[PDB]
Design a protein around this ligand. Structure first.
Ligand code: NAD
Ligand code: NAD
Lengths: 348, 353
């Protein structure tokens, strides 16, 4: 009968009441379970996303990301990547919303912020992959790109690895200099370091940049620690990549969603037959993976809508428990299903 | 900064304030103008829609339909086709919503009902096509399928043609028997007739059925009037058609969106090279359909997002005039754009507890 809307105030209230670490852990755990279900064939990857490329102000994309859970509900995330937003408008680069529709009737049942949820599930996905593929004694995290995603990359990874420090870089000096402040709550010490130094000293790296098509790589084609694990998180336009080919070619590479990664991930640079097993496979059999901790690995992360559905369920469970959100009758359900004009009662 | 939400009460208030006839005329005018722009090369057809097919309890589909106006905004209609809804749940078959996103920032700026808007723009499109291709003195309308769309097909067509009566059929007796009451506001007399009589007597027909994949036609190929114009409106799943092949083969056929129609319309049955000029080309230059009023013609209608964007503008102009809708901060816009955790929860009390 009415759409449950959770906007920014309620989302803030969930975080305040649950706690950042606990919320992140719930999302890590949900994703881990969901990916293992996919890996056993009990659930299935989302369809490929689509989007509309926008050339201005600077090149970006607005995308739609559906996922169906048959007999239950459809999730739709709608999300912009607008890399001029922070400096031009004081808005995040990544701006979106997540909707849920009843699978049986089509009715819009819930709608909420996608900005926070996106950042949380993206950190979580890197944590799932890094727990499997990073050495368990990893002490140094490298971050290339210190914008929004970097915050939750650090946070999530601090929950699953014994991180002592983060070596960080961004092409924008103001964005790298403010990272320590944004990261303070994790307790991981931050040091600004050049990409060459990050590549050489990190045990684990996340790359999460707004680099343009034709502007990589964001790390040099260098020698790295033999156990290095990299989460390649930047992803937006077709053509956009962050890692040097010569590094990728000697890595074990696991995509979150192989078809989508081959279009918009690092796997753009590779043949399909060069890809290792997908992340869900590793989640269903963590022993396919553990043996790969000690050699070079890359998690090619594009994000996919099932992750959004799961993250949304975490928020919906917490909100329901606290009676958060409002109810809005958005869709018109006529008094007679066969009469679009049965709008009664008319106001005044 | 916040999303403008026009929900069910506000859409109702627009209909009440503007009136059903005027609202539909505005939408007719707006679609005509926009289609002409496409026909002139000033604007472009929407990308092909996407969807997720769903088999139970009866096969339907949930679709997304984007249309971008570069530098201004992106419209997205999300809409379900679920043809067990009226009998099982008392909900319309077609259920959806229309959203607008700022093209520059990606921000969700507006969200509104898509149920009414869809019915209105779908009637309007048949009026646009029928004003071009039906005889101006058409008096008898036929309707095959007398569900929700059939109401606005009659309404819209009554506004552009001197209709005196409607001959109507549905496979569900209860649905064809309630059509007179739902149509009464148009003034057009309604009589139930079988499809063969409709085919023989109508000057203009609209087909808007929930017929299943592969289970057409819904109208037989038997002795039609020479000048008949048909709006083929049913469209959901790939494989769904309503008209007989033999009829289409001898008609002048115009699609609203050729590539889309070739996928989901009657044009599934035809080759691309056998289509007439698309509807946009006819709106840009009505002479491209010179003479076709007096011979067999088919408008193959599937719907496309630009139509929703134009209908949505009509509603937003009316709702802005009357200060309608609510404003809801749905998207999180952290004070520091690079800090997803820069949230602002309500402040805790200062005073001793
Ligand atoms: N994998 C996923 O699931 C997923 C989800 C959300 C976002 N993303 C992607 O992550 C990327 C970053 O998003 P964000 O929200 O952090 O954006 P952001 O604008 O907040 O941060 C991006 C940072 O990258 C920096 N940068 C640009 N080019 C660089 C380079 N060559 N080297 C180092 N730094 C550079 C920018 O100055 C900026 O600080 C985008 O590509 C986005 O689409 C991926
Ligand atoms: N072209 C467009 O732009 C557009 C837009 C909206 C809806 N549609 C489509 O129009 C069709 C009707 O939608 P609606 O909202 O009116 O649905 P509805 O369920 O309200 O009505 C459809 C009617 O078709 C009847 N029917 C089923 N099979 C039939 C047959 N063989 N002969 C006669 N009647 C039959 C049903 O009993 C029902 O009364 C659907 O395919 C829908 O997806 C098209």
């Amino acid at each position: 009968m009415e759409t449950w809307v959770l906007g920014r105030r309620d989302v803030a209230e969930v975080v305040a009441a649950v706690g950042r670490d606990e919320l992140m852990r719930r999302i890590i755990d949900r994703l881990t379970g969901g990916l293992a279900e996919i890996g056993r064939g009990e659930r299935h990857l989302s369809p490929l996303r689509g989007g509309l490329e926008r050339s201005e102000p600077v090149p970006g994309i607005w995308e739609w990301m559906p996922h169906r859970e048959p007999g239950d509900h459809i999730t739709l995330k709608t999300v912009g990547y607008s890399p001029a937003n922070p400096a031009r408008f004081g808005l995040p680069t990544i701006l979106g919303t997540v909707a849920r529709y009843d699978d049986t009737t089509g009715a819009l049942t819930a709608l909420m912020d996608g900005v926070l949820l996106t950042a949380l599930r993206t950190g979580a996905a890197s944590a799932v992959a890094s727990r499997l593929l990073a050495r368990p004694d990893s002490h140094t995290l490298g971050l290339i790109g210190t914008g929004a995603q970097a915050v939750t990359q650090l946070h999530a990874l601090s929950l699953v690895l014994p991180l002592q420090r983060a070596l960080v870089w961004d092409t924008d000096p103001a964005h790298r200099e403010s990272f320590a402040r944004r990261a303070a709550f994790t307790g991981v010490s931050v040091e600004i370091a050049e990409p060459a130094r990050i590549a050489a000293e990190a045990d684990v790296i996340s790359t999460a940049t707004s680099v343009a098509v034709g502007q990589g790589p964001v790390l040099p084609d260098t020698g790295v620690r033999e156990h290095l694990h990299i989460n390649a998180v930047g992803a937006d336009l077709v053509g956009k990549t962050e890692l040097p080919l010569g590094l990728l070619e000697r890595a074990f590479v696991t995509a979150d969603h192989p078809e989508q990664a081959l279009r918009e991930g690092e796997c753009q640079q590779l043949s399909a037959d060069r890809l290792g097993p997908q992340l869900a496979h590793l989640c269903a059999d963590p022993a396919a993976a553990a043996g790969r901790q000690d050699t070079l690995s890359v998690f090619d992360s594009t994000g996919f809508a099932f992750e959004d559905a799961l993250a949304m369920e975490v928020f919906l469970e917490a909100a329901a428990e606290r009676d958060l959100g409002i109810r809005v009758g958005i869709e018109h359900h006529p008094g007679d299903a066969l009469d679009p004009y049965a709008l009664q009662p008319l106001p005044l």
